[PDB]
Design an enzyme around this catalytic site. Structure first.
Site, short mmCIF file in Angstrom:
data_model
loop_
_atom_site.label_atom_id
_atom_site.label_comp_id
_atom_site.label_asym_id
_atom_site.label_seq_id
_atom_site.Cartn_x
_atom_site.Cartn_y
_atom_site.Cartn_z
N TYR A 80 0.80 -1.27 0.00
CA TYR A 80 0.00 0.00 0.00
C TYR A 80 0.83 1.30 0.00
O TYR A 80 0.29 2.39 -0.15
CB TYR A 80 -0.91 -0.01 1.23
CG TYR A 80 -1.85 -1.13 1.28
CD1 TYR A 80 -2.98 -1.18 0.41
CD2 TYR A 80 -1.69 -2.16 2.18
CE1 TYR A 80 -3.82 -2.22 0.44
CE2 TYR A 80 -2.55 -3.22 2.20
CZ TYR A 80 -3.62 -3.21 1.36
OH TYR A 80 -4.52 -4.22 1.44
N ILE A 103 -4.00 1.42 -5.74
CA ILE A 103 -4.22 2.85 -5.89
C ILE A 103 -4.81 3.41 -4.62
O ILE A 103 -5.93 3.04 -4.20
CB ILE A 103 -5.16 3.19 -7.07
CG1 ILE A 103 -4.73 2.43 -8.32
CG2 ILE A 103 -5.26 4.70 -7.30
CD1 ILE A 103 -3.47 2.92 -8.91
N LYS A 180 -17.73 -3.20 -0.27
CA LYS A 180 -17.91 -4.65 -0.48
C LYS A 180 -18.63 -5.37 0.65
O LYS A 180 -19.32 -6.35 0.38
CB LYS A 180 -16.62 -5.30 -0.75
CG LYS A 180 -16.11 -4.89 -2.12
CD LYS A 180 -14.80 -5.54 -2.44
CE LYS A 180 -13.69 -4.59 -2.15
NZ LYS A 180 -12.28 -4.80 -2.61
N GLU A 211 -20.63 13.11 8.18
CA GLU A 211 -19.20 13.31 7.79
C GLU A 211 -18.74 14.72 8.00
O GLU A 211 -19.37 15.62 7.53
CB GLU A 211 -19.04 12.95 6.34
CG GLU A 211 -17.65 13.09 5.77
CD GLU A 211 -17.57 12.71 4.25
OE1 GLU A 211 -18.54 12.11 3.67
OE2 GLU A 211 -16.48 12.96 3.67
N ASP A 213 -15.61 16.84 7.02
CA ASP A 213 -14.35 16.86 6.27
C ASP A 213 -13.51 18.02 6.77
O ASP A 213 -13.84 19.16 6.60
CB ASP A 213 -14.65 16.95 4.81
CG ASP A 213 -15.44 15.84 4.34
OD1 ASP A 213 -15.02 14.69 4.51
OD2 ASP A 213 -16.50 16.07 3.74
N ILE A 214 -12.48 17.73 7.49
CA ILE A 214 -11.53 18.75 7.99
C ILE A 214 -10.62 19.29 6.87
O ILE A 214 -10.31 20.49 6.78
CB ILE A 214 -10.60 18.09 9.04
CG1 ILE A 214 -11.41 17.44 10.17
CG2 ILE A 214 -9.67 19.17 9.59
CD1 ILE A 214 -12.27 18.41 10.92
N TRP A 215 -10.24 18.41 5.93
CA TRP A 215 -9.17 18.72 5.00
C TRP A 215 -9.40 17.83 3.79
O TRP A 215 -9.24 16.60 3.84
CB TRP A 215 -7.81 18.45 5.58
CG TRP A 215 -6.68 18.89 4.71
CD1 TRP A 215 -5.77 18.11 4.05
CD2 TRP A 215 -6.29 20.23 4.46
NE1 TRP A 215 -4.89 18.86 3.39
CE2 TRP A 215 -5.15 20.18 3.61
CE3 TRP A 215 -6.78 21.48 4.81
CZ2 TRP A 215 -4.53 21.31 3.15
CZ3 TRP A 215 -6.20 22.59 4.28
CH2 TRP A 215 -5.08 22.51 3.48
N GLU A 216 -9.82 18.43 2.69
CA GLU A 216 -9.81 17.76 1.41
C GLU A 216 -8.95 18.64 0.50
O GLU A 216 -9.29 19.83 0.31
CB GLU A 216 -11.18 17.59 0.79
CG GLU A 216 -12.02 16.60 1.56
CD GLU A 216 -13.35 16.26 0.96
OE1 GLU A 216 -14.41 16.87 1.42
OE2 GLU A 216 -13.33 15.34 0.06
N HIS A 227 -21.16 17.67 6.47
CA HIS A 227 -22.24 16.90 5.87
C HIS A 227 -23.07 16.28 7.00
O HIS A 227 -22.56 15.48 7.82
CB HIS A 227 -21.74 15.72 5.07
CG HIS A 227 -20.79 16.04 3.96
ND1 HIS A 227 -21.22 16.10 2.66
CD2 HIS A 227 -19.46 16.24 3.93
CE1 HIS A 227 -20.17 16.33 1.87
NE2 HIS A 227 -19.10 16.46 2.64
N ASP A 257 -23.56 17.17 -0.90
CA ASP A 257 -22.77 18.33 -1.24
C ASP A 257 -22.06 18.81 0.05
O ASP A 257 -20.91 19.22 0.00
CB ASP A 257 -23.58 19.47 -1.80
CG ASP A 257 -24.21 19.23 -3.13
OD1 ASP A 257 -24.05 18.20 -3.75
OD2 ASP A 257 -25.06 20.08 -3.47
N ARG A 395 -13.67 26.72 -9.03
CA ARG A 395 -13.29 26.05 -7.79
C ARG A 395 -11.78 26.18 -7.49
O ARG A 395 -11.37 26.14 -6.28
CB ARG A 395 -13.57 24.54 -7.89
CG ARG A 395 -14.90 24.08 -8.47
CD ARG A 395 -16.02 24.56 -7.63
NE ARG A 395 -17.33 24.20 -8.07
CZ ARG A 395 -18.18 23.39 -7.45
NH1 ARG A 395 -17.79 22.64 -6.42
NH2 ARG A 395 -19.38 23.25 -7.91
O1 LIG Z 1 -18.04 13.31 -3.48
C1 LIG Z 1 -16.91 14.05 -3.78
C2 LIG Z 1 -16.95 15.22 -2.88
O2 LIG Z 1 -18.14 15.85 -3.28
C3 LIG Z 1 -18.29 17.07 -2.64
O3 LIG Z 1 -19.47 17.80 -2.99
C4 LIG Z 1 -19.53 18.61 -4.09
C5 LIG Z 1 -20.38 17.84 -5.01
O4 LIG Z 1 -19.60 16.64 -5.15
C6 LIG Z 1 -20.67 18.64 -6.26
O5 LIG Z 1 -21.60 18.06 -7.09
C7 LIG Z 1 -21.24 19.96 -5.86
O6 LIG Z 1 -21.50 20.79 -6.98
O7 LIG Z 1 -20.20 20.67 -5.14
C8 LIG Z 1 -20.06 20.03 -3.88
C9 LIG Z 1 -19.10 21.03 -3.24
O8 LIG Z 1 -17.88 21.14 -4.01
C10 LIG Z 1 -18.42 16.79 -1.19
O9 LIG Z 1 -18.58 18.14 -0.82
C11 LIG Z 1 -17.09 16.24 -0.66
O10 LIG Z 1 -16.95 16.24 0.80
C12 LIG Z 1 -16.80 14.93 -1.37
O11 LIG Z 1 -15.45 14.40 -1.03
#
Ligand SMILES: OC[C@H]1O[C@@H](O[C@H]2[C@H](O)[C@@H](O)[C@H](O)O[C@@H]2CO)[C@H](O)[C@@H](O)[C@@H]1O
Ligand SMILES: [Ca+2]
Ligand SMILES: [Ca+2]
Ligand SMILES: [Ca+2]
Ligand SMILES: [Ca+2]
Length: 431
Positions: A80, A103, A180, A211, A213-216, A227, A257, A395
């Site tokens: 990995y 991957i 899975k 969810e 998300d702290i950091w993407e 979320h 979203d 974006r």
């Molecule tokens: O699922 C991937 C990613 O999606 C993120 O949301 C997006 C959404 O995917 C898109 O259609 C919409 O227009 O914009 C939102 C915000 O950019 C979701 O926010 C993420 O946490 C996730 O990893």
């Protein structure tokens, strides 16, 4: 799933800091990255991106017949491309092993051999360091929290005997069908192989939960997103409840979203990136504060540190159109979604109060490195939808042609992310 016995399970040690004291913990690989085989021998149950039709003629028989195997000390790096030392963990993108190629990865922070660490983030400051310099357009090195079960499912789902010890029980706000095992059962009914990911497919069931998300991020763009879902913790879904991409997106039990705070999207293009105010070319410290009022979350604030500088979060920059919010709040979410013409599914699913209750119940820490077979990470770092010219489309600085997994897997296989110095403690003052 039950656990196989071909390979012993070893969690990779990792140190972190909890309320002022050093914790000698470890991480575990998510079950989806493991070998799934017959309980009797080495025959694959999951073979390429389809299930074996003789072993797995239906989900219940598949679950009876198939096992997920361990990851031993050497497998972490060999298969990995994952390494750890001290408080530092490094994930790899493409690792070519003996006979196959991996991957990315997804791992969870353990409390002990059998249970995930549970974080109660309300009225706390969570911080860590990240080096995202070696993540191009198209990659996501992510650190986030999900409302998984502490034991990975073993108490609620009797056919899950493998549990958190084998990385079981992932769920997130996408209600993903590519898991899975869901609810302790093989997700083999209705399985369709992916057209563009030779390791992936989708099954009837999805795995939903809250969810944070702290950091993407990659070296070009970064976001943090809350979320909320209308269901309580880990929740299997079928049908409309999963809110599948497309016509059903807003019709399920989770906000896909999210209420996202992405500086570049919010009109602050030089804040983060190569040579940015926050420079993605070097390690940075990401500080996140879960501020409460009357015991309930009312604001998620962000501070950065880098080279000894304290850098406040960049404020929304649409003068005269949106106020200069600089954090996730209810009013931000409402106002920005209106300006961007985004459906406010965050509020539909419970909004800040909803999120608050999710955080109160405790979350698991996730670190991952992935590419995006659905949308090529364009929602993070480019323009999305690709031909859209209205507010909120733009974006990041990347091309709308960037991020195709076949391209990035070929061109930047050596990409990596390093996370370090994970810490939770009281909310601190930052002058
Ligand atoms: O699922 C991937 C990613 O999606 C993120 O949301 C997006 C959404 O995917 C898109 O259609 C919409 O227009 O914009 C939102 C915000 O950019 C979701 O926010 C993420 O946490 C996730 O990893
Ligand atoms: Ca049997
Ligand atoms: Ca059925
Ligand atoms: Ca329906
Ligand atoms: Ca838009």
């Amino acid at each position: 799933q039950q656990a196989g016995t071909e390979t012993e399970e070893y969690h990779l040690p990792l140190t972190w800091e909890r309320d002022g004291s050093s914790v000698s913990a470890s991480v575990v690989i998510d079950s989806n990255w493991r070998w799934t085989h017959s309980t009797e021998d080495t025959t694959n149950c999951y073979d390429g991106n389809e299930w074996d039709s003789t072993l797995c003629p239906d989900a219940d028989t598949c679950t009876e017949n198939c096992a997920i195997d361990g990851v031993d000390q050497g497998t972490w790096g060999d298969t990995y491309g994952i390494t750890a030392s001290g408080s530092k963990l490094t994930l790899s993108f493409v690792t070519e092993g003996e006979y196959s190629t991996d991957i990315g990865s997804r791992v969870f922070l353990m409390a002990d051999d059998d249970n995930y660490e549970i974080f109660n983030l309300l009225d706390k400051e969570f911080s860590f360091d990240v080096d995202a310099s070696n993540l191009p357009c198209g990659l996501n090195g992510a650190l986030y929290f999900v409302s998984m079960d502490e034991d990975g499912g073993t108490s609620k789902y009797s056919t899950n005997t493998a549990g958190a010890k084998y990385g079981t029980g992932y769920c997130d706000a996408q209600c993903p069908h590519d898991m899975k095992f869901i609810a302790g059962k093989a997700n083999s009914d209705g399985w369709t192989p992916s057209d563009n990911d030779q390791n992936a497919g989708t099954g009837e069931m999805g795995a939903c939960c809250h969810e944070m998300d702290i950091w993407e991020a990659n070296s070009q763009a970064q976001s943090y997103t809350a979320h909320v879902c209308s269901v309580d913790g880990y929740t299997p879904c079928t049908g409309t409840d999963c809110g599948d991409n497309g016509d059903d997106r807003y019709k399920g039990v989770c906000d896909k979203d999210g209420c996202d705070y992405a500086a570049y999207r919010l009109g602050q293009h030089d804040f983060y990136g190569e040579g940015g105010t926050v420079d993605s070319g070097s390690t940075l410290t990401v500080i996140t504060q879960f501020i409460t009022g009357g015991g309930g979350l009312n604001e998620i604030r962000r501070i950065y540190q880098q080279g000894g500088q304290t850098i406040q979060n960049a404020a929304v920059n649409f003068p005269g159109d949106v106020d200069p919010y600089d954090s996730i709040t209810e009013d931000f979410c409402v106002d920005i979604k209106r300006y961007f013409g985004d459906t406010n599914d965050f509020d539909a699913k419970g909004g800040m109060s909803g999120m608050s209750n999710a955080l109160k119940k405790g979350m698991v820490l996730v670190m991952s490195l992935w590419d995006d077979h659905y949308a090529n990470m364009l929602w993070l770092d480019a323009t999305y939808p690709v031909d859209s010219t209205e507010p909120g489309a733009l974006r990041g600085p990347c091309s709308t042609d960037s991020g195709d997994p076949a391209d990035v897997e070929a061109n930047f296989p050596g990409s990596t992310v390093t996370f370090s110095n994970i810490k939770i403690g009281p909310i601190q003052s930052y002058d």
